[PDB]
RNA sequence: GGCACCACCAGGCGUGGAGCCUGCGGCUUAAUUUGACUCAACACGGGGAAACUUACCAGGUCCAGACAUAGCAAGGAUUGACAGACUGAGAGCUCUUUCUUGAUUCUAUGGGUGGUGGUGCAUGGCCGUUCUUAGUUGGUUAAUUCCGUUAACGAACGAGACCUCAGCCUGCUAACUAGCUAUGCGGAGCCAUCCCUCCGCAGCUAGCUUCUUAGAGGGACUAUCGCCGUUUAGGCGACGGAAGUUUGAGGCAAUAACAGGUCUGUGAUGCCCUUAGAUGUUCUGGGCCGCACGCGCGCUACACUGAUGUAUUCAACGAGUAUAUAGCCUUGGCCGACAGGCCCGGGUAAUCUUGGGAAAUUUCAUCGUGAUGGGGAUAGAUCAUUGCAAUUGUUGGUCUUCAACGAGGAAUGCCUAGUAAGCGCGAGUCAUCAGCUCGCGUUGACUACGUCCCUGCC
């Protein structure tokens, strides 16, 4: 019964990292963004974004409560020791998954690459973000395979920052040639209130107040 | 009051425990406790290396990954209920509270 | 008799034993903190396990 | 060659050839042991063999 | 393939009463967690199930998840002889 | 024209020569599975394979062939099995035998499914490399770094900034899982006591935070001085300072590429092959270790600046259990020459292992220039431990055996300070096996502060 510190925090991070597999595999149409664990002292709160949150509750919450049921019986919670719930992600433009997901649709519909990268660029321009990316990479039109990038705006790509101001995904189209690789960066802005980017300005940017 | 209260808090990180043990030892000394804390333990490195390479070409270059478990102890007189009272405020995401009475 | 002489060799122990958690491969796999992931599948998921690299 | 696989041996309407109801009257007159083992019911016929009555459900084996 | 009366009826009174089954890849695990069925039974039996539409089937860590659908909600009613 | 110890210079330590370890080729083989071949393959696939892994070989099983269609079928579709035979086998695998079982199956067609099967020259992701270079007139800089010249100015990415670790703080915050100091008591010494010295124990009312920890901050900016420099940008020297070599070391890291590697990481994958006498899966056994030979990374040496046997005493990084009689790290006691065993326990951990009782080093003695008490390859006997299993020696011991090697040709590698080199420890792998890697500390230099001579790049 007593788990060390260790095996406690190394077990954390591997059911954070199972939990967020198997609701992408599962929420994948539902625009799932990411999932918010949060132990309560009663029960271990369990936060899903998305896009389509009343896809992931389904008909009078039976999806999401399915899902609670899988969670606890699955990850041996103790009943009622789990509570899945849904809520609304603020700016879609400004998440790198929702827009890599929303990519992944719009090319397993059909739609031509280059029309729906600019569209995803687009869309998060006017979102907000600072500067945005998409890269295409597969056989897009012929056999042998090659990479088309889709840049606008301003990017870093060095140090520490990036790990505060990029946010990023990497997906997946499964066609019939074959497989088509998503990577899209957003690039955020400085928000002094924490919401759209981070609260932190990038180093090498110096304000004077005038006199 | 009575009884011996140790309360071990643990994280991942820095500034959320920090700010847990500021709200601890902060109801405890408006409370009129006496606490002894917070108490920081040395903190724990948990280390991975592994070679980056998904196979075995290329220069063999090493990720070093690090986890760091921040150990803090708050050591109070008192008796359950004010611990409770005082450990029911929101504690934020990572923290691991853990409340273990004593003689 | 074939159900005991199918799976019939023991698996207390060795390579062929113990899986990777994500995709049960036996190859690289990273037993230390009770982690159980494979080398390749421990690099692709170390950030959402908590992992940080600082050095 | 390639081994042949064992197929179960088919004897039409075993039952018919298990109990000897006849002689008019009513006499059921079972014509091989039911097997003791209480799982094993009365209507578990104990088969026998050129010597040992061998139940099929489970194992239990007589010889002479 | 040949799975007893009882195993059967057993794997599909708990789906029924949950509405969702979990394994994990293990075909020699000798008994499901929960029914009392090894892990190969309830993963046959899931599978078969799912190729008449009678569950959602999703495979994510070595792990299966089934959800049954509203067609499953009436094969089970129906073969569990009570609602 | 520049730059760079993956270039040289001045050197240090080497490798290349020897024995052995390990990887690659070749040969042999039933198979000795295979990918990778200049940097950018070759202790690489975290690839230290007894079984599993395993992809290979010799065999044996099993269906884990959903679903749809058509048949066979309660007068039974089908299933399991005692004994004997068969079998490597206590696989009813098959056969004899005759019970048992009950629409789950079975037979045929489609359709699926699995595959460490092919294709990395179909792909994704990832990774390696170009290149961590600095890139996208002139001076200076680590730098497309600045200055300066000017039909360019103003920007952006990259560089730096940033982040982490380390270095400083007698300031701050705080410690019964860290200590110090004092007090009291006790022990020993001296001789008693006292004092003094060295110890042990106690006190959440003994204080405190120097030492330990870990948070917050501070702190260096080339700041000050001289000289040089267009008197700029910068450089050299000097004081002070913990720090003056953007303080040291990392992490991150542009554009554009390469038919670079990976389909054997992936329930990432298109296509192709196979799919029940299977390239699926499992079990047994073998192989991946095979040995005329070639090559690469290494370990151990060639000794007296040493070996051996005493005495002696300084680290750091990290790791650790399901408590079941007990699993992991093991303390203490006992038995045992060792190997190991037995018995009480502690620890899910700044609490117990662990103040981590590391070695090199130090000290004394022996040896005495002799392949010698250097070296320890090979080999015999034997005893223990891990394991289901130790043979093709897992490993660890005991006694014995006592090879080459006396510093290594032509070549060629790494390295500018707590660095090289030496020394040991920890972790990963792991039931057991570390001559390997990834870290750690201990001891601690020589030489240079340049150049384009070579090599490469721009
Ligand atoms: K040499
Ligand atoms: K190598
Ligand atoms: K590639
Ligand atoms: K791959
Ligand atoms: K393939
Ligand atoms: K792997
Ligand atoms: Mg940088
Ligand atoms: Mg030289
Ligand atoms: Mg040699
Ligand atoms: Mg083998
Ligand atoms: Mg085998
Ligand atoms: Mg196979
Ligand atoms: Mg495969
Ligand atoms: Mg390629
Ligand atoms: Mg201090
Ligand atoms: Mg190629
Ligand atoms: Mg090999
Ligand atoms: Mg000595
Ligand atoms: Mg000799
Ligand atoms: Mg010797
Ligand atoms: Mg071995
Ligand atoms: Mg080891
Ligand atoms: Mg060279
Ligand atoms: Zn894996
Ligand atoms: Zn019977």
């Given at each position: ?31 799932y ?21 009343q896809?992931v ?9 399915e ?26 433009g ?26 995803v ?13 998409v ?32 946010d ?44 | ?69 921040h150990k ?8 359950p ?23 | ?39 390749q ?5 170390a ?9 | ?27 059921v ?8 083992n209480?799982?094993?019911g ?21 010889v002479? | ?13 708990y ?45 994510s ?23």
């Amino acid at each position: 019964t007593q788990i060390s510190k260790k095996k406690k925090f190394v077990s954390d991070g591997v059911f954070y990292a199972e939990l967020n597999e198997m609701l992408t595999r599962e929420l994948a149409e539902d625009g799932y963004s990411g999932v918010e664990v949060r132990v309560t002292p009663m029960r271990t709160e369990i936060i899903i974004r998305a896009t389509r949150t009343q896809n992931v509750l389904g008909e009078k919450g039976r999806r999401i409560r399915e899902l609670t049921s899988v969670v606890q019986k699955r990850f041996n919670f103790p009943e009622n020791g789990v509570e899945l719930y849904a809520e609304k992600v603020v700016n879609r433009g400004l998440c790198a998954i929702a827009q890599a997901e929303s990519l992944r649709y719009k090319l397993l519909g059909g739609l031509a690459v280059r029309r729906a990268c600019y569209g995803v660029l687009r869309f998060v321009m006017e979102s907000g973000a600072k500067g945005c990316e998409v890269i295409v990479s597969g056989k897009l039109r012929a056999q042998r395979a090659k990479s088309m990038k889709f840049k606008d705006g301003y990017m870093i790509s060095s140090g520490q920052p990036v790990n505060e101001y990029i946010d990023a995904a990497v997906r997946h189209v499964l066609l019939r040639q074959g497989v088509l690789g998503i990577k899209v960066k957003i690039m955020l802005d400085w928000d002094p209130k924490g919401k759209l980017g981070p609260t932190t300005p990038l180093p090498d940017l110096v304000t004077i107040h005038p006199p | 009051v009575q009884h011996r209260i140790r309360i071990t808090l643990s994280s991942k990180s820095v500034k959320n425990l920090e700010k847990v043990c500021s709200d601890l030892v902060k109801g405890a000394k408006e409370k009129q406790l006496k606490v002894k804390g917070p108490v920081r333990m040395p903190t724990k490195v948990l280390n991975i290396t592994t070679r980056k390479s998904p196979c075995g070409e290329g220069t063999n270059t090493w990720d070093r990954f690090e986890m760091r478990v921040h150990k803090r102890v708050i050591d109070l007189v008192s008796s359950p209920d004010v611990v409770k009272q005082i450990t029911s405020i929101t504690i934020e995401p990572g923290v691991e509270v853990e409340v273990t009475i004593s003689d | 008799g074939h159900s005991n002489v199918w799976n019939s060799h023991p698996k207390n122990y060795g390579a062929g034993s113990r899986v990777c958690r994500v995709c049960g491969n036996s190859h690289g796999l990273i037993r230390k903190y009770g982690l159980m992931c494979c080398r390749q599948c421990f690099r692709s998921d170390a950030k959402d396990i908590g992992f940080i690299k600082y050095r | 060659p390639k081994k042949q696989k064992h197929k179960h041996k088919k004897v039409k309407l075993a039952v018919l050839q298990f109990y000897k109801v006849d002689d008019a009257t009513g006499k059921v007159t079972r014509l091989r042991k039911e097997c003791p083992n209480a799982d094993c019911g009365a209507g578990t016929f104990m088969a026998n063999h050129f010597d040992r009555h061998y139940c099929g459900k489970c194992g239990l084996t007589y010889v002479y | 393939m040949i799975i007893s009366k009882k195993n059967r009826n057993e794997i599909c009174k708990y789906l029924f009463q949950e509405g969702v089954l979990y394994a994990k890849k293990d075909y020699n695990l000798a008994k499901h967690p929960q029914i009392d069925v090894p892990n190969l039974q309830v993963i046959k039996l899931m599978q078969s199930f799912k190729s008449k539409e009678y569950v959602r089937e999703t495979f994510s860590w070595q792990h299966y998840y089934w959800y049954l659908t509203n067609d499953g909600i009436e094969f089970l009613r129906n073969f569990l002889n009570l609602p």
